[PDB]
Amino acid sequence: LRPIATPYPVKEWLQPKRYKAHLMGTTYVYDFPELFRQASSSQWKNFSADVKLTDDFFISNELIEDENGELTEVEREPGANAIGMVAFKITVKTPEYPRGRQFVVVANDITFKIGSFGPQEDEFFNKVTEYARKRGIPRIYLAANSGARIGMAEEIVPLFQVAWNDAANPDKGFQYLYLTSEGMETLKKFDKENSVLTERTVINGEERFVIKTIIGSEDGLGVECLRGSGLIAGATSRAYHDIFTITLVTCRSVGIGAYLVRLGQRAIQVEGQPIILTGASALNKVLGREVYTSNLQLGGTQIMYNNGVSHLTAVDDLAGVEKIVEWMSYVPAKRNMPVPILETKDTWDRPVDFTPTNDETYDVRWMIEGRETESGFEYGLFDKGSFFETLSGWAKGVVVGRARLGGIPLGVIGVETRTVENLIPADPANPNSAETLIQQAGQVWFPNSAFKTAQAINDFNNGEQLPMMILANWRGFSGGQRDMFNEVLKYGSFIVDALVDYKQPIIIYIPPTGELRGGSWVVVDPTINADQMEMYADVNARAGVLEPEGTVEIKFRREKLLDTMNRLDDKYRKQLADRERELLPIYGQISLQFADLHDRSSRMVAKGVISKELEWTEARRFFFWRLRRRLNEEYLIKRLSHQVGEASRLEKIARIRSWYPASVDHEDDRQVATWIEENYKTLDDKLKGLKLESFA
Amino acid sequence: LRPIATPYPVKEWLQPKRYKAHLMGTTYVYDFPELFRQASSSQWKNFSADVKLTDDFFISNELIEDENGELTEVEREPGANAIGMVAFKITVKTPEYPRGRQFVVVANDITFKIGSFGPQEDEFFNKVTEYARKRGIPRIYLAANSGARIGMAEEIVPLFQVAWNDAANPDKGFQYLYLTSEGMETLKKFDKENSVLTERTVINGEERFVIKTIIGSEDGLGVECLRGSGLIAGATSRAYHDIFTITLVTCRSVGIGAYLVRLGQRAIQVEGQPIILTGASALNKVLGREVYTSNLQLGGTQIMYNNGVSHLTAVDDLAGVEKIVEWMSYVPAKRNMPVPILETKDTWDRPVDFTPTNDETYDVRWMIEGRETESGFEYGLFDKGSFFETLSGWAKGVVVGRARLGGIPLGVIGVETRTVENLIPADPANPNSAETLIQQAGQVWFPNSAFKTAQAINDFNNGEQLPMMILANWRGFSGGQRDMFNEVLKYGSFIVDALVDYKQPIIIYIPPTGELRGGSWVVVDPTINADQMEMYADVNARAGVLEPEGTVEIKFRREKLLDTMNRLDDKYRKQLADRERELLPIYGQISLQFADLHDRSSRMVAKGVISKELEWTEARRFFFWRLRRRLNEEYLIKRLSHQVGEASRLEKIARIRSWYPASVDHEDDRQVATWIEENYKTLDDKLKGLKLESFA
Ligand SMILES: Cc1ccc2cc(CC3CCN(C(=O)c4cc(-c5ccccc5)nc5ccccc45)CC3)ccc2n1
Ligand SMILES: Cc1ccc2cc(CC3CCN(C(=O)c4cc(-c5ccccc5)nc5ccccc45)CC3)ccc2n1
């Protein structure tokens, strides 16, 4: 016992494994449910300071496998785990789910054979993944490991012999490894006969059993651990499309551990905890030179957060757990359940205060969440304090996060208008390599920002099942040599693919001072997914194939400018050339203005390419009721789908809308939402009566 | 008429549009079906030189929209197209489909408004895509365009007036653009009232109609072309997952044209024909410096073929058409039809001649397709002349292509064992940028080669619907700083995702002299997709978590080596240190051999991680019958699926196998395939009788 005379019992002495996990710079596995309780208690405190929580608000039950390999809940003392993988089923009352929400927490035990993954740990992690998937509940993975377990047949070590080329001179070489009759007998005795595959031979009177293959009696030495690693890699790939998946990197995550981080997609990395494949010293041995200094050089946050492999960083394990809990607050309690509404002080019924200006630099986050000023807070489009930014270390030209609109959770994608700089590190393996600073113009999609946008769309859709708003403001894609060589077309195409797959309502909105041109419009047009997408443009937004400079270059050339001077200038209508020299700068401005007059939201409305033209200050009120109406109609379309056999979206929506009273304006979002909400049970009666269907 | 006195009529005079397409360095649209006839005739000549083809072997029928917008077949004179998009339905008798196969060819007409995409061209291209998708037939796109159509309201050009700040001094500026009563009347007269949105004002006695927005009477000016571009981008994204999609870049492909190339995935680029977004001169104007010299610098084959955006290059349009036809020869006639068997001179019943050696450098293509030697041809694993390599300009560390195994078409992925070099061009926009040469070690996955592998798996699965063989031979992934920063984990994870989605049989085979370690095994393990995947290892292959050097470093350390010297060396069992110095180099070799003895295919079999251990020379015979048996069982599993409502793969296969006579060995591939093929109609009788099912 160290230390002596403490007021309460020494937990690191009661369970020495707790001390071992601490020495490795991580939380002991069995202490993680307490971090989740602390983080959930903080959630309530930030939401409503006066709430009185009792311990029954949070329940953690360890999951273990019974005799039949089926998962069962247990209450046992920490550290009794016979495998290096542990899991907990958590039931917690949260501000968004005050009656309770559930999720599973899977975690490596860093104290159990260094958190290595053997076949038993792989099979348990897979069983836990399937358990969560069957229930539709989130799967949280706490990564603290050493990758696949590695071993040798330790029983053959004191038994094997060597067929020396020259017995007197060992340095001269050897032919093979073998066992003697007594070696074979030792194996026969301990029932380890199948530990080796041998070929009996006789050399100078003595029978030698030539070792052809070493198998070993102990399970979890090599290939069997690689099979289990593949199983859990595929399981995680599947889980990402099915349930909400997230990983906290709490101590190192090696090999399969690094792949699990990425396969679950959503990842929070604790600072100083590396995500690696082969380590620095192993790499150095292969390279035959001291190239790398540390594992943190290979997989620290300055690699992974800058990459977008880590969506967020955390200063410590509790900060990481808090970020999991905060991320989950935007996510349904289980698969296919409605998105969790959480109304706060900042109600839908207000104008948007922060307005961008053409003559002034702004941070898009101000438009999203608002900004603090000396004269008071300027409210943004979304709820005050609701913006949760993710992938904040990578491709900063695009701003992605979760926010709330009058309480409705949604994914938000905005455009950073300021020039973004990123530092490409010098390659330690190349002596002729130096660090590169890359500058990327604002409102231009680059390979990295296009990849981040596609990734965001997929992460809001899969597991999170959230509606989305893109505040579309791009001039185009980078068509330059470097970015074209770096496959900008591939990443831009991933955006189209991500939108095709989207299952919840989408709002595309060109904001005030905003623009959408050529290739940038293409990749975000609502006809990519007409079932879910709608486009809107601000009265102060612009859009066309080219910018006015481009349009004039192709369609308002010198001949047309001169005919315009001929019509409009009395002096014009060698003495022409000097007049042309004087008129050209202003006539170039007239032509640019003429072109800009086509790029208005009024032309977008007339041509039917946008649903409506909007005023920014009224966009919060408009979008709140539009989104609320859309969620309600989507619920009814899904109910009608359950009883038909075969009908299109257009036919399903036309039928639902035919149930609305004649006096209801189908174009009034607030009226449609209000009527549906007042009639959910009446609509249920109607849907249940439609089960008079016999379709073959 | 130019030239005069030709033996036959001047086609470039009869149809001047033919001459215009030629002046633009491309085939005239209406001459493309003839290139397909020429290429299909060549297919027959290469297959069986003595075949007698008549003109009824190939039929091309132009598709146009009728009064109701429905596609109908027409026989009309070339050049009568009222839109800049044309399509043909092709019916061709090929060596793989001697009774005929069909596909659609969609193409821009470069002579029609520079191949620009207006709303009508977009709607026709979408209608053609849907037509092919509904029928399950391939969609071939011939890209020769200028992107989205750009325009202005040309009727407002001679009408608009300017509100000068000072009428006498135009240079001093202007307030707005306006129309007069006579301007408004001109618009009223020609029924173009809605061409502008105006605001009537009176300034110094005269009524001025202030132009607030220019709309225009002509359709296809701006945003409406961007909507149509989005529609066809989404349509192509969908088509790729549904039917076989391919694009030939035959003249430039701009904007939406560049996106269509990528969205259809499979692309052949004719040399000197660029795939661009914004062009060089437009980019130069934005950058305010002469940065780029040409469009070919931005999107030539040296960009796109090196990127993997272009799967192949072609010296000319006919070479391109021939490569389409050759690619299609491995693909089913329509969606869900069986893969086309094409038996040639090189029959299944032979050993594999080319065998790799540990002490000698080899090209993996020799193992795949064989090699010419002075002593004769050394046959490879696959049919002689059947290897069709694709993505050959990009990530050369991985070799991808289509091949045939005793006539069975399949996707093949092999590993290039030689060091691969690639040249990263100097960024023209950065004066402080120079070209970089990157060397990549063989048998190591890098971000580019991992992306190429995932891309290949997806392209064999989607549309092609082919079985696959991966000749798995990777030591691991590059875990170094540069490759980790360059997101190797993301690309490696895409491999897992691509395997999860795979719908046809997969063979993973570790070849002779081959190896599969740590992270490389993980990403290719058959438990990722147990319904489709099987793994095999050569008797001369190796596999474990680490390489023997790594295993000894962790599990056979100095203490263990010294205890081994204590047991095996009579002299060992300060006078120890000098003995240690002498023994250590050979005892290090013993420990490496001890570790290598665990890495054998015999341990893989014993641990149940591979289906069988094989001998390379017998692999062609083994895999032919294994694949043939698997295709037959897959056909029956799909038939059983059509009549059940709910049953797992394991239950479906167990039922099918219960139909085999008792004397049939379920493990004998050749016997199982033979029995199924002799009993297809009898099995059909049994399946039709199982339609006594009433499941609710
Ligand atoms: C690194 C970088 C930085 C900015 C980028 C902007 C775009 C947008 C397109 C719009 C379409 N387009 C034009 O429409 C255009 C814009 C301008 C232009 C605009 C603003 C200032 C100066 C010039 N001049 C032109 C000249 C000829 C043809 C087209 C134009 C070109 C430019 C694309 C890639 C970019 N890459
Ligand atoms: C650019 C590059 C080049 C080659 C690469 C090879 C690997 C494979 C792993 C296997 C696992 N592993 C070992 O198992 C290992 C191999 C060797 C080694 C092998 C051959 C020659 C020299 C050393 N020495 C070691 C030392 C300590 C720990 C592990 C080892 C390391 C190396 C990964 C990335 C690489 N990147």
Curated annotation (Swiss-Prot), chains A, B:
It comes from the Eukaryota. Residues 7-343 form the CoA carboxyltransferase N-terminal domain. The keyword Lipid biosynthesis applies. Keywords: Acetylation, ATP-binding, Biotin, Cytoplasm, Endoplasmic reticulum, Fatty acid biosynthesis, Fatty acid metabolism, Ligase, Lipid biosynthesis, Lipid metabolism, Manganese, Membrane, Metal-binding, Multifunctional enzyme, Nucleotide-binding, Phosphoprotein. CoA binds at R252, K555, R557. Changing Y259F: Does not affect catalytic activity. GO terms for biological process: acetyl-CoA biosynthetic process; fatty acid biosynthetic process; long-chain fatty acid biosynthetic process; malonyl-CoA biosynthetic process; protein import into nucleus. Changing L226I: Raises KM for malonyl-CoA by a factor of 20. Disulfide bonds: none annotated. Homodimer. Present with 20200 molecules/cell in log phase SD medium. Carries out three functions: biotin carboxyl carrier protein, biotin carboxylase and carboxyltransferase. Involved in the synthesis of very-long-chain fatty acid synthesis which is required to maintain a functional nuclear envelope. Required for acylation and vacuolar membrane association of VAC8 which is necessary to maintain a normal morphology of the vacuole. This is Acetyl-CoA carboxylase. The gene is ACC1.
